[PDB]
Design a protein around this ligand. Structure first.
Ligand code: MN
Length: 442
C-alpha cells in the first residue's frame, strides 16, 4: 500500500518541468523525491540518471515499491491506489514494469531481438518504470558512464533477462510521441483509444513535450474556482518590486509618446523603469529623460544586466507596439505567478485584426504554426493559462527565471524569437493568459 516516486531532475536550479511534476505529484497525494536536485547535469546519453538513482537508492533500505520517472516532460494523472492496482495486475510476479513506446531506440538493430507482439507499442522506454527497490538496485548496482545511454542499458536488460515486463497496454505509462491520434483529454485524464486505457503517467517523450504542454491547459490539479473572474479588478495587498523594461524607438516619436502614456497609466507603486531605445535621437532623449532618467540608446537586444543589479523581483518586458489598456494588469499577472507558472504573457491582438495575437500555439522549424485550439484561444472560447512555445511584447518573468538562467542564447538573430528559444531550451515554460481584455498591438 506504500509507494514512493523517484523523479529524476538533475539540475542546479529547478526547471518548470520539475516544478510542474512536483505540483501534479502533490495533487494526487504521491510521495516523491527529486533525484539529483541541486546537482549539475553532465549526461543519446543519460547515464548520469542511473548513477544518481543508485545514490538515491542507498537511502532507501527497506524493499519499497518505487516508481522511477523523468520529470521535465512528464506528469502523473492519478494517485497511489490506482498505480498499485495496475502494478499488481500487470505483474503478479512483482517484476519491474517499464513503459512501452513505438520506436526501437537508440539501437534500431534490437528490432529482431524484441518479443513479437500484436500491438504497435513494441519497445522499451526508460523514461518511466516501477518495481521493488532491491530489484532495481540489482540491475544498476555497478553504475554506468555518465555519457552511456540509459535507454539502451535497460533495453538490453529487458531482452536479455526476465527481470522486466513492458506496459504494452499503456496502463501505468504513456510515451506520447507520435501517438497523437490515440490520445484524447477526457474527465481530467488522458484516454488512449488504441489501448483502451487511461495511462497514469503522461510522458511527452522527445518532441512530444509539445503535445503534453498543449494538453496541460486542459488538465487541473484541483477543481477550478469558478468565481476567479467574477470580480475582474485586481489589487495586491503587498506589491513586490517590478522592473519595467521598455523596448522603444524614438525615431517614431508619436508611437513612443502614445506607448509611454499607456505604460504610465499601469497602476503600480513599487517599480523601477528603464527605457531601451533602438535609436539615438539626442534631442528626443533629452525631452523624455526628464520623466524617464534611466534611458539607454542603440539597444537592439533584450537587456538583463540592469535588472540583475537591481533588487526587483519581477522583470516586465514591454515592446513599443504593445498598447496596454487594462490598468490593473500587473496585479492580475503577479497573482498568477506560482509554482511552474513563472513567465506569463497577456494575450493581445492587432487593433485591425484581433485574431492575430502576441503568442503562437505551435511552432514548426522555428516559426508560427496554427495549433488545434489557436482560434478558440484567440476568440476567448476558453480562458486561462496556456503553455505555448512563443510569447511576444508583454511578458512578466519572475526573478528566479531571469537571475538563474541564460536568456540571451542566439539561434534566430531575432530578439523576441531568441528569448523564447532560450526559455524552451531550459524547460522554462511560457504561459499565455487570456482571462481579460488587456490591450492590443499596433
Ligand atoms: Mn522524458
Amino acid at each position: 500500500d506504500n509507494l514512493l516516486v523517484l523523479g529524476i531532475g538533475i539540475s542546479v536550479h529547478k526547471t518548470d518541468g520539475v516544478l510542474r511534476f512536483e505540483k501534479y505529484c502533490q495533487a494526487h497525494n504521491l510521495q516523491y523525491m527529486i533525484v539529483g536536485e541541486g546537482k549539475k547535469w553532465n549526461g543519446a546519453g543519460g547515464g548520469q540518471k542511473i548513477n544518481e538513482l543508485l545514490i538515491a537508492l542507498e537511502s532507501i533500505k527497506d524493499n519499497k515499491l518505487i516508481v522511477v520517472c523523468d520529470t521535465y516532460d512528464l506528469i502523473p494523472l492519478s494517485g497511489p491506489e490506482e498505480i498499485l492496482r495496475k502494478y499488481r495486475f500487470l505483474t503478479p510476479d512483482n517484476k519491474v514494469v517499464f513503459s512501452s513506446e513505438l520506436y526501437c531506440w537508440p539501437d534500431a538493430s534490437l528490432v529482431e531481438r524484441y518479443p513479437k507482439v500484436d500491438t504497435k507499442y513494441k519497445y522499451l522506454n526508460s523514461g518511466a518504470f516501477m518495481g521493488y527497490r532491491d530489484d532495481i538496485y540489482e540491475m544498476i548496482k555497478n553504475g554506468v558512464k555518465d555519457r552511456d545511454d540509459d535507454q539502451l542499458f535497460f533495453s538490453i536488460k529487458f531482452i536479455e533477462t526476465d527481470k522486466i515486463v513492458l506496459d504494452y497496454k499503456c496502463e501505468l505509462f504513456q510515451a506520447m510521441y507520435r501517438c497523437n491520434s490515440d490520445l484524447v483529454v477526457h474527465k481530467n485524464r488522458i484516454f488512449n483509444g488504441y489501448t483502451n486505457s487511461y495511462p497514469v503517467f503522461a510522458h511527452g517523450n522527445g518532441p512530444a513535450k509539445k503535445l503534453l504542454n498543449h494538453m496541460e491547459g486542459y488538465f487541473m490539479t484541483e477543481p477550478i474556482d469558478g468565481s476567479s473572474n467574477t470580480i475582474n479588478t485586481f489589487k495586491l495587498d503587498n506589491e513586490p518590486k517590478v522592473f519595467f523594461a521598455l523596448y522603444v524607438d524614438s525615431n517614431d516619436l508619436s508611437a513612443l509618446k502614445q506607448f509611454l502614456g499607456k505604460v504610465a497609466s499601469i497602476q503600480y507603486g513599487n517599480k523601477v523603469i528603464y527605457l531601451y531605445d533602438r535609436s539615438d535621437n539626442e534631442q528626443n532623449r533629452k525631452l523624455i529623460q526628464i520623466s524617464y532618467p534611466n534611458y539607454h540608446t542603440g539597444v537592439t537586444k533584450y537587456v538583463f544586466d540592469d535588472f540583475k543589479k537591481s533588487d526587483a523581483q519581477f522583470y516586465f518586458l514591454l515592446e513599443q507596439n504593445c498598447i496596454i489598456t487594462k490598468k490593473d494588469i500587473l496585479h492580475e499577472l503577479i497573482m498568477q505567478v506560482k509554482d511552474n507558472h513563472r513567465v506569463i504573457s497577456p494575450m493581445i491582438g492587432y487593433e485591425q485584426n484581433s485574431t492575430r495575437t502576441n503568442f503562437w500555439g505551435d511552432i514548426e522549424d522555428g516559426y508560427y504554426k496554427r495549433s488545434e485550439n489557436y482560434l478558440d484561444l484567440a476568440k476567448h472560447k476558453v480562458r486561462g493559462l496556456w503553455n505555448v512555445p512563443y510569447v511576444y511584447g508583454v511578458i512578466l518573468m519572475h526573478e528566479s527565471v531571469v537571475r538563474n538562467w541564460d536568456l540571451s542564447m542566439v539561434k534566430y538573430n531575432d530578439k523576441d524569437m531568441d528569448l523564447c528559444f532560450s526559455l524552451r531550451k531550459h524547460t522554462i515554460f511560457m504561459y499565455m493568459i487570456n482571462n481579460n481584455n488587456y490591450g492590443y498591438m499596433v
